[PDB]
C-alpha cells in the first residue's frame, strides 16, 4: 500500500562472447568466403577504413 | 571472380579435397576412416 514511486532500469549481460559484424551483404553465414568479400568493388581496388 | 591464384593454391576457393587429392590417397583415406582418421588433415573450401 505504501509503495514509493518507481523508476525502471534496464541492462544486459553477455560475457564469454564476441560481438560479431559479418562482412556480408545480408549478415548471414553462407560460407567462409563471404559474398561481399569476393565482390568486385572490394576484390579489385584498394580502400581505407575508419 | 574466376582467377585469383593464391586462393586456388591455398584451397581458400577451388576444388574440394575429395577431388584435388590424387585419387589413390582418397581411396586409402576412405578405407581407413574407422581406425586411422585421415580426413581431418586436409582442407575443403566453402564459397558463398
Amino acid at each position: 500500500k505504501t509503495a514509493v514511486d518507481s523508476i525502471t532500469q534496464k541492462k544486459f549481460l553477455c560475457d564469454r562472447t564476441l560481438w560479431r559484424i559479418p562482412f556480408s551483404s545480408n549478415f548471414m553465414s553462407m560460407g567462409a568466403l563471404t559474398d561481399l568479400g569476393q565482390n568486385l568493388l572490394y576484390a579489385n581496388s584498394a580502400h581505407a577504413l575508419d | 571472380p574466376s582467377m585469383m591464384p593464391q586462393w586456388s593454391y591455398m584451397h581458400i576457393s577451388g576444388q574440394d579435397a575429395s577431388e584435388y587429392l590424387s585419387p589413390g590417397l582418397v581411396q586409402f583415406a576412405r578405407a581407413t576412416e574407422t581406425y586411422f582418421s585421415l580426413n581431418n588433415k586436409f582442407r575443403n573450401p566453402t564459397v558463398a
Binding site: 553462407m30 560460407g31 | 577451388g14 576444388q15 574440394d16 575429395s18 577431388e19 575443403n44 573450401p45 566453402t46 564459397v47 558463398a48
Partner: peptide, 25 residues
Amino acid sequence: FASLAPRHGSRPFQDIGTSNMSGGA
C-alpha cells in the same frame, strides 16, 4: 536448376513439412 546455392566446392549444395499433435516424432 538455380545455382544460387551455397557452395562447398565444385559441387554446389525435398520441400517437406508436417507435424501434427500425434504422429511418431
